[PDB]
Amino acid sequence: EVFNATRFASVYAWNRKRISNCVADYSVLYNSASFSTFKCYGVSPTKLNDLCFTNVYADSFVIRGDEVRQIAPGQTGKIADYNYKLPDDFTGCVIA
Amino acid sequence: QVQLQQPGAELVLPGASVKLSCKASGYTFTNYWMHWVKQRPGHGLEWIGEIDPFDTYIKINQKFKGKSTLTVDTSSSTAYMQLSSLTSEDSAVYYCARPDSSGYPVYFDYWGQGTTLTVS
């Protein structure tokens, strides 16, 4: 649902999902042959399945190809400074 | 403080294999992938491949396919290479590069010492 749908929220207001109380197989998404960018900071995907966390949040928004770069910690840019900024201690995964 | 020590001073006659170690300390061996870079003065640095800890996920750079091998042991936080049939064109220095995160793409923020490969 958070990966394939008719329309998602735009970068001006990205939506949060609060995915929890369920199991996940991150390697299924890892092995997919359509996702290009997988800048997933913090816990490695190979141990992401085994590692248990309090919650796994979700995001979805539309940004330019050259402005995908602006969703990383310690970053400046048009989207990064104005629409969406990431904490310097970020932990999670990013897919584009 | 982050410690990434290297044994260094690796010399083997051509046609044989040598063992390289990369002991990591000062951070998490679980949450940090291991990436390798070889320093050649002729044309600068180059990427070897990527290995995940406590598993056998293999991704080898198209430049050093075949000879390059990836081996990681959870105990002692040591990652290994045993490159068989080293030639006289392989005389250079090996560095194991720690990345900022364990998710590609990365930029290998912290590099340790270098293990020199030399043919005698």
Added chain:
Amino acid sequence: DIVMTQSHKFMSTSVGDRVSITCKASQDVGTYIAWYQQKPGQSPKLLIYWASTRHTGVPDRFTGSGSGTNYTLTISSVQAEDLALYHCQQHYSTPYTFGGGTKLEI
């Protein structure tokens, strides 16, 4: 894959001079270039972890710019410790490539 071929074979600038380090990219990868400081006899040390950002422990002299295809790093002043090698890498895809390096001298 994307291959790094820097355009500055050597850089000859004095102390405090304003000059840029230009490295090209094989194709338009947007902005995914990184920089390292490799002193002679020293492992390459991260200087600007991204195209135009600033990592921890960075001298204020280093500041890069990303035009999309021709990435440059402009340095207002050059000190003794800056005498090292400059490397560019593409963190866009899995197969990584490194630049040839540039030696700085007075």
